[PDB]
Amino acid sequence: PRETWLLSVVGFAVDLANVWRFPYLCYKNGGGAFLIPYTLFLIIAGMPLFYMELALGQYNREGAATVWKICPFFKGVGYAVILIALYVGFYYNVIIAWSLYYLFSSFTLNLPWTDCGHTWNSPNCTDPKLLNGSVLGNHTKYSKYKFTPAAEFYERGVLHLHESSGIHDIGLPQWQLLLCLMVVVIVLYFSLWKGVKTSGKVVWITATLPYFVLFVLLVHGVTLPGASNGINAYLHIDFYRLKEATVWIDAATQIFFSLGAGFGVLIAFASYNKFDNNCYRDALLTSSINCITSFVSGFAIFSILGYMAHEHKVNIEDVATEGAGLVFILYPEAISTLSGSTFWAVVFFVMLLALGLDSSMGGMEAVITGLADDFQVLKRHRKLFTFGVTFSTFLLALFCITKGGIYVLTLLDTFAAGTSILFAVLMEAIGVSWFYGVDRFSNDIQQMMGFRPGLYWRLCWKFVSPAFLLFVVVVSIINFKPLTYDDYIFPPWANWVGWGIALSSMVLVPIYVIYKFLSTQGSLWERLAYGITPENEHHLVAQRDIRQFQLQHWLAI
Amino acid sequence: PRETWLLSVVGFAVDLANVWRFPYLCYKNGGGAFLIPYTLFLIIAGMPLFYMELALGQYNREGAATVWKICPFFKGVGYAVILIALYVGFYYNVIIAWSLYYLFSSFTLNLPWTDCGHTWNSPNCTDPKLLNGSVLGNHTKYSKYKFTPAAEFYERGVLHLHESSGIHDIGLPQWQLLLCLMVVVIVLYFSLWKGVKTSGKVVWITATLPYFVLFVLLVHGVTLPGASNGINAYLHIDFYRLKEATVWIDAATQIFFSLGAGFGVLIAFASYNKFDNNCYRDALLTSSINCITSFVSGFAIFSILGYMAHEHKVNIEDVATEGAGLVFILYPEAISTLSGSTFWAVVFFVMLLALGLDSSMGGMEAVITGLADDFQVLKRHRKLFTFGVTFSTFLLALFCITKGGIYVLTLLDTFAAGTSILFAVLMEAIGVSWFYGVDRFSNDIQQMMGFRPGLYWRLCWKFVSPAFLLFVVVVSIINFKPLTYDDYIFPPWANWVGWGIALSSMVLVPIYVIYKFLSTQGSLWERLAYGITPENEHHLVAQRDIRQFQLQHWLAI
Numbered sequence A, B: 001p002r003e004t005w006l007l008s009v010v011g012f013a014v015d016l017a018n019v020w021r022f023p024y025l026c027y028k029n030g031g032g033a034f035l036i037p038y039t040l041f042l043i044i045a046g047m048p049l050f051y052m053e054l055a056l057g058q059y060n061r062e063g064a065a066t067v068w069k070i071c072p073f074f075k076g077v078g079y080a081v082i083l084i085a086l087y088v089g090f091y092y093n094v095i096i097a098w099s100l101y102y103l104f105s106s107f108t109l110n111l112p113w114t115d116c117g118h119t120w121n122s123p124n125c126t127d128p129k130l131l132n133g134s135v136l137g138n139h140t141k142y143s144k145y146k147f148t149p150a151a152e153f154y155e156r157g158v159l160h161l162h163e164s165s166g167i168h169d170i171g172l173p174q175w176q177l178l179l180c181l182m183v184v185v186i187v188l189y190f191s192l193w194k195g196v197k198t199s200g201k202v203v204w205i206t207a208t209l210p211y212f213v214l215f216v217l218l219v220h221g222v223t224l225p226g227a228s229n230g231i232n233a234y235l236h237i238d239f240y241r242l243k244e245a246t247v248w249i250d251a252a253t254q255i256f257f258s259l260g261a262g263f264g265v266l267i268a269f270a271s272y273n274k275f276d277n278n279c280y281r282d283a284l285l286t287s288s289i290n291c292i293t294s295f296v297s298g299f300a301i302f303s304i305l306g307y308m309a310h311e312h313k314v315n316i317e318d319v320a321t322e323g324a325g326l327v328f329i330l331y332p333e334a335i336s337t338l339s340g341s342t343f344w345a346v347v348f349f350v351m352l353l354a355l356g357l358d359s360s361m362g363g364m365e366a367v368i369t370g371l372a373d374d375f376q377v378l379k380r381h382r383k384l385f386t387f388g389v390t391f392s393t394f395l396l397a398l399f400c401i402t403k404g405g406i407y408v409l410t411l412l413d414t415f416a417a418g419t420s421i422l423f424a425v426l427m428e429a430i431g432v433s434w435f436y437g438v439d440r441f442s443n444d445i446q447q448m449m450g451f452r453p454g455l456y457w458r459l460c461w462k463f464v465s466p467a468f469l470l471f472v473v474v475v476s477i478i479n480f481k482p483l484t485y486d487d488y489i490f491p492p493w494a495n496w497v498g499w500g501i502a503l504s505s506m507v508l509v510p511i512y513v514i515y516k517f518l519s520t521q522g523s524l525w526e527r528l529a530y531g532i533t534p535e536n537e538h539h540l541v542a543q544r545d546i547r548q549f550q551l552q553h554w555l556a557i
């Protein structure tokens, strides 16, 4: 009785990651120096894996962990992606709480991020080109220009980060953000407690509104005084950055964040698709729009960065932060220039709130669907189970609504789904292409969509995707950089705590294999066969008909 | 198929609480000023409630949460005591780790707590009366004399508390204590994974060894140079302290810690007693020995405190700490005076290790039995469930093995089982004496032990016990004192965090009643009846035969 389900694909393409995460990853890794790795990972890994995750859930009709009946030893990969989805939900909800606070603050004729006369603002808060306040001048620049009305509003007005000295002194949860976080978790609860398709209104709003706003920002941005300089930066490619490995790791993780692969969302979502649904069309369409949305997102962001650098008399590289709060500074700065700013402020933060809600809904659905498919008891107690998932997320999100929650969020955004998600998607590709068989997988898609995937897809699923995923995983560990939020440098123990979060999900795969073998009764050969054979044909193990014990299985594409 | 089970009662009487917690509670609340409240709470509340908890588990054959089939609305009381048992297990295991470290350090001809020439020792570490090192003299005293070899060894040698400034800067888990904690959780796992009576050797050792060592310490202590002054302090009663409420709250919580009532241990343990077992004899015997053990424990401790004050030229009130590490300073100081100290050091810490292991085993059994009786699935997966309980305890015990884990332990020892345990035992007494009926309870004991409890027990169970429990609960909240470890005063937020821990268990009772009523289907009257009627006669609810809807039920003793 599984609840099987134009604007659908376009809404799926837009995500809090494409509108909030991509901009700062692009800004940090240079404008076009990030596009080259991003497009490569999308075509050789992102799009291929998106098609695999869609087909895996649409053929087995299962969530992230229960699709591993095809190869039992790999259920730890399903538990790992569900843990990653939970970790990301903690700080995703905090981004929605910021949008809710910004929305509530937008209902004023005078927006709070336009001038420096407020209580939160520090003496060091220069009004761009004396826009509102005309005092002194710009005679000094800063590594990160946090002395702008919009920056000061985000840092002091909303986060109260000025009250935290680091991840060692996070402080107490901010009450205004605690109220916003509670509204977010209440909306999330009543959007998931009665099922998966229970919530459709947010999906509809997050299908056209995001594109419309991006278009308005893009058209207005290109006409801003110094937008051209930003456009030039976006177009220029820094080849030296390509030699460095950071851009490649950032691009790969962003691909899985922007597409949703490696969180269990795609498999859980496709578990309710019709068996005949064309995953290939959906993969191509979503990936193509994601590439366009990401490109136009960076163009708009760099146009605003160009104007901001012109208005603040700073260099584009030093005009804004490269953290998770860049869109809460750049977009507010752009809305102010738009006539009828109050209207645009409300419309923009309504879009951010809506986009974040679906993003959090999909992640929590992956956790709920994944665990409910594993334990049918949780399927009959959804309202109670949803409460547990939402409440746990709210409590652990309380760490990021603290005066130093940006430091905790930077840590989570870097380790909750970095090497861990690349390792999980690598294990899934290896599990389906080598242990299960790309040939069997292709026959599965031939049964579902009526055609066997082309050699390009088969080669990517078995060799190209895994090889590139293995390279970025190894490079992530070999060339790991100490975590830093802007000027602040994290204490060494925070990096170890971050690696502990990363390993937490990664260790589930080895631990499950140990558990599966120990829990199995038989000879070492028999136990190994039971762990690699489809759980629908374990009788073949009794008859000694193991395809994985034949060299042709590993020689089949 | 429940696994139904002289030295037994004597071993049950001795506990880490009687040998480790009582001494510092007695020292903090004066010698005999604590005995008066302690003896009162034991006779009017402790012993009466011990008999109720023993009979409740021996008649219903259930753990802390599943015994509430008699009155359904109260299962939150069972969940509350299981949560308290888990909270206490976190820092109980850390006390066992200290005993393991002290045991490993005792295998030397020269004990580490006898002199101040070691690396851990600070310049301020005076050898008592220049015992080992003869330099300078005693010309200044201190609020807490932490400049003694034994004190410095505990604080700097073992805890490394000198590396933490407070609960704000706990630091990293000490690796030597991390190794000791891992051995403790491994021993606990293999003592619980295969059942309840799986471990009997520790029970046998902790039946005579504790008494023997206490006797040796008592006989040697009374002969120590300044022991008389300590004896005089123990005998003297400070009436002004009796007027204060702290001694009463401390005495009441110690009674439930020393007897095991309010952690779910007594009910779970009695669930495996034979139906004919005489709870009354066991209650009288255990309570009588607990009163004697506690009295002689304080006599030995105050005799060592008297000698230490004489040797350190300090006042007994300022000679030692009043925290959870008093026995790791006083007993080491006494062992040193005993000829063949190395032998006595090993024997003493072997006793502490053994006593702690059973204490932790009983608490974890309450959590495992309580949850396994609730969920029969956990009964079939004991080795896996035990792992989860032990592993979770180990991870949360990692907070107390940190350089500032004594601060976390002080917080847990004050809030994990303080007002919360008094509230839980109050709710259990109210639930069985008023909602279920002391008359019904007495008929249950008449069926089990062949006699109806006397009016004294019935009056205590319905009026005396609850009234005194209600008084200490209200007094605990009305006259709460800010937490302080020795000189250190906790930051105000730590007190709120502590009250959050206390309320966590306490809120389970209200939350369960809300859940039970909402989960029940029927009229408000019908739902209320279903929540107060024995779950074996819910047909009476259909026939409108509710004893609790008759005034005589609340007028019956």
Ligand SMILES: CCCCCCCCCC(=O)O[C@H](COC(=O)CCCCCCCC)COP(=O)(O)OC[C@@H](O)CO
Residues within 6 Å of the ligand: A075, A079, A083, A374, A375, A504, A507, A511, A512, A515
């Ligand atoms: C750092 C943790 C180290 C031990 C943590 C993991 C140990 C043992 C799990 C394990 O391996 O057992 C799995 C079930 O796993 C779960 O529940 C989810 C719990 C995973 C824990 C999340 C960790 C959070 C930091 C049982 O899998 P299964 O036997 O295939 O389940 C089948 C059954 O559900 C329905 O047939």
Ligand SMILES: CCCCCCCCCC(=O)O[C@H](COC(=O)CCCCCCCC)COP(=O)(O)OC[C@@H](O)CO
Residues within 6 Å of the ligand: B075, B079, B083, B374, B375, B504, B507, B511, B512, B515
């Ligand atoms: C600060 C938490 C606020 C919500 C936390 C509590 C909510 C809802 C529990 C609740 O009320 O449901 C109970 C089962 O409760 C449990 O599991 C233990 C879990 C308790 C959570 C420990 C809290 C740790 C800080 C279900 O009780 P039941 O319906 O009588 O169970 C019968 C079934 O087990 C076998 O028939």
Ligand SMILES: CC(C)CCC[C@@H](C)[C@H]1CC[C@H]2[C@@H]3CC=C4C[C@@H](O)CC[C@]4(C)[C@H]3CC[C@]12C
Residues within 6 Å of the ligand: A090, A167, A168, A169, A170, A396, A399, A408, A411, A497, A501
């Ligand atoms: C299994 C689930 C519960 C794991 C939860 C993971 C997250 C929420 C945990 C794991 C490690 C944690 C961090 C460990 C240590 C510190 C330093 C302290 O000074 C502030 C909190 C902070 C920064 C913690 C924030 C929350 C944290 C990131």
Ligand SMILES: CC(C)CCC[C@@H](C)[C@H]1CC[C@H]2[C@@H]3CC=C4C[C@@H](O)CC[C@]4(C)[C@H]3CC[C@]12C
Residues within 6 Å of the ligand: A170, A171, A172, A173, A392, A395, A396, A398, A399, A402, B493, B497
């Ligand atoms: C078991 C899991 C799901 C939930 C446990 C997480 C709870 C206990 C955590 C999450 C966030 C935490 C809070 C985060 C920050 C602070 C500020 C600090 O100055 C005092 C403690 C306080 C107020 C913490 C109390 C404990 C807390 C609420």
Ligand SMILES: CC(C)CCC[C@@H](C)[C@H]1CC[C@H]2[C@@H]3CC=C4C[C@@H](O)CC[C@]4(C)[C@H]3CC[C@]12C
Residues within 6 Å of the ligand: A172, A173, A174, A175, A178, A395, A398, B500
């Ligand atoms: C611990 C879990 C289970 C639930 C409780 C969450 C706690 C940590 C949360 C919930 C309510 C919060 C408080 C709400 C409002 C205020 C007032 C102001 O001074 C800011 C801090 C303070 C005091 C918050 C501190 C953190 C807080 C106490």
Ligand SMILES: CC(C)CCC[C@@H](C)[C@H]1CC[C@H]2[C@@H]3CC=C4C[C@@H](O)CC[C@]4(C)[C@H]3CC[C@]12C
Residues within 6 Å of the ligand: A181, A182, A183, A185, A186, A189, A383, A387, A390, A391, A394, B518
């Ligand atoms: C904001 C954070 C701190 C807490 C969130 C708690 C939420 C999830 C809780 C608190 C009150 C709860 C509601 C209380 C009562 C009912 C009526 C019942 O027949 C269906 C569920 C429902 C509607 C509950 C759903 C979950 C609920 C909304």
Ligand SMILES: CC(C)CCC[C@@H](C)[C@H]1CC[C@H]2[C@@H]3CC=C4C[C@@H](O)CC[C@]4(C)[C@H]3CC[C@]12C
Residues within 6 Å of the ligand: A182, A186
């Ligand atoms: C726990 C903290 C956050 C308090 C939350 C208060 C609010 C958000 C909660 C408390 C009780 C809740 C209500 C309880 C019962 C119902 C009936 C249900 O069929 C629909 C939702 C509705 C109408 C809930 C809406 C949300 C609600 C009003």
Ligand SMILES: CC(C)CCC[C@@H](C)[C@H]1CC[C@H]2[C@@H]3CC=C4C[C@@H](O)CC[C@]4(C)[C@H]3CC[C@]12C
Residues within 6 Å of the ligand: A375, A376, A377, A378, B377
């Ligand atoms: C068929 C029956 C036995 C199903 C049993 C349900 C079990 C397997 C499910 C239901 C509730 C779940 C737990 C709920 C909450 C937590 C705490 C979290 O920090 C780690 C995961 C953990 C520990 C979950 C593990 C999986 C779980 C234990």
Ligand SMILES: CC(C)CCC[C@@H](C)[C@H]1CC[C@H]2[C@@H]3CC=C4C[C@@H](O)CC[C@]4(C)[C@H]3CC[C@]12C
Residues within 6 Å of the ligand: A377, A378, A381, A384, A385, A387, A388, A389, A391, A392, A395
């Ligand atoms: C946020 C932290 C502190 C608490 C989280 C509590 C969550 C994980 C707990 C509390 C109540 C629990 C539920 C209580 C009862 C049942 C019914 C049972 O047949 C299946 C499991 C299920 C549905 C439990 C799943 C786990 C659960 C939802």
Ligand SMILES: CC(C)CCC[C@@H](C)[C@H]1CC[C@H]2[C@@H]3CC=C4C[C@@H](O)CC[C@]4(C)[C@H]3CC[C@]12C
Residues within 6 Å of the ligand: A511, A514, A515, A518, A519, B383, B384, B387
């Ligand atoms: C620090 C820890 C997490 C390291 C990893 C420990 C893992 C591998 C351990 C912890 C507890 C173990 C389980 C405990 C009990 C059983 C039941 C037994 O009949 C088969 C093996 C099985 C199912 C074990 C499998 C391996 C296991 C899951």
Ligand SMILES: CC(C)CCC[C@@H](C)[C@H]1CC[C@H]2[C@@H]3CC=C4C[C@@H](O)CC[C@]4(C)[C@H]3CC[C@]12C
Residues within 6 Å of the ligand: B090, B167, B168, B169, B170, B396, B399, B408, B411, B497, B501
């Ligand atoms: C449901 C279970 C997991 C609850 C766990 C309760 C215990 C282990 C938790 C709850 C609140 C916690 C404390 C909250 C805040 C601080 C201050 C920080 O600077 C050091 C850790 C310290 C002192 C925490 C230690 C661990 C703690 C006491």
Ligand SMILES: CC(C)CCC[C@@H](C)[C@H]1CC[C@H]2[C@@H]3CC=C4C[C@@H](O)CC[C@]4(C)[C@H]3CC[C@]12C
Residues within 6 Å of the ligand: A493, A497, B170, B171, B172, B173, B392, B395, B396, B398, B399, B402
């Ligand atoms: C879900 C429950 C059962 C387990 C979660 C508790 C874990 C995540 C907690 C318990 C104790 C914690 C540690 C306690 C103290 C420190 C020192 C600090 O300077 C860095 C973080 C570090 C090293 C913590 C890391 C996270 C930690 C290991």
Ligand SMILES: CC(C)CCC[C@@H](C)[C@H]1CC[C@H]2[C@@H]3CC=C4C[C@@H](O)CC[C@]4(C)[C@H]3CC[C@]12C
Residues within 6 Å of the ligand: A500, B172, B173, B174, B175, B178, B395, B398
């Ligand atoms: C997080 C949970 C799931 C498991 C991991 C526990 C972590 C917090 C524990 C386990 C091993 C511990 C480390 C073991 C030994 C050392 C070396 C020395 O410098 C002291 C600190 C340090 C570095 C410890 C810090 C805390 C630590 C990292």
Ligand SMILES: CC(C)CCC[C@@H](C)[C@H]1CC[C@H]2[C@@H]3CC=C4C[C@@H](O)CC[C@]4(C)[C@H]3CC[C@]12C
Residues within 6 Å of the ligand: A518, B181, B182, B183, B185, B186, B189, B383, B387, B390, B391, B394
């Ligand atoms: C010390 C802390 C950090 C971790 C403790 C982990 C313990 C509980 C784990 C680690 C290794 C585990 C063992 C590994 C394998 C087996 C064999 C299996 O057929 C029965 C269970 C048994 C014997 C496991 C019991 C639980 C176990 C001992």
Ligand SMILES: CC(C)CCC[C@@H](C)[C@H]1CC[C@H]2[C@@H]3CC=C4C[C@@H](O)CC[C@]4(C)[C@H]3CC[C@]12C
Residues within 6 Å of the ligand: B182, B186
């Ligand atoms: C996880 C960390 C603490 C490592 C723990 C290592 C030690 C304590 C563990 C690892 C593997 C374990 C062994 C694995 C399997 C068995 C067979 C079982 O029938 C009895 C216990 C025994 C013999 C275990 C004893 C404890 C053990 C040796």
Ligand SMILES: CC(C)CCC[C@@H](C)[C@H]1CC[C@H]2[C@@H]3CC=C4C[C@@H](O)CC[C@]4(C)[C@H]3CC[C@]12C
Residues within 6 Å of the ligand: A377, B375, B376, B377, B378
């Ligand atoms: C009959 C079937 C459905 C039984 C289901 C088992 C459920 C009810 C049991 C088994 C595992 C348990 C969970 C294991 C671990 C945790 C995490 C802890 O922080 C809070 C309690 C919590 C959340 C437990 C609640 C009760 C639990 C969810």
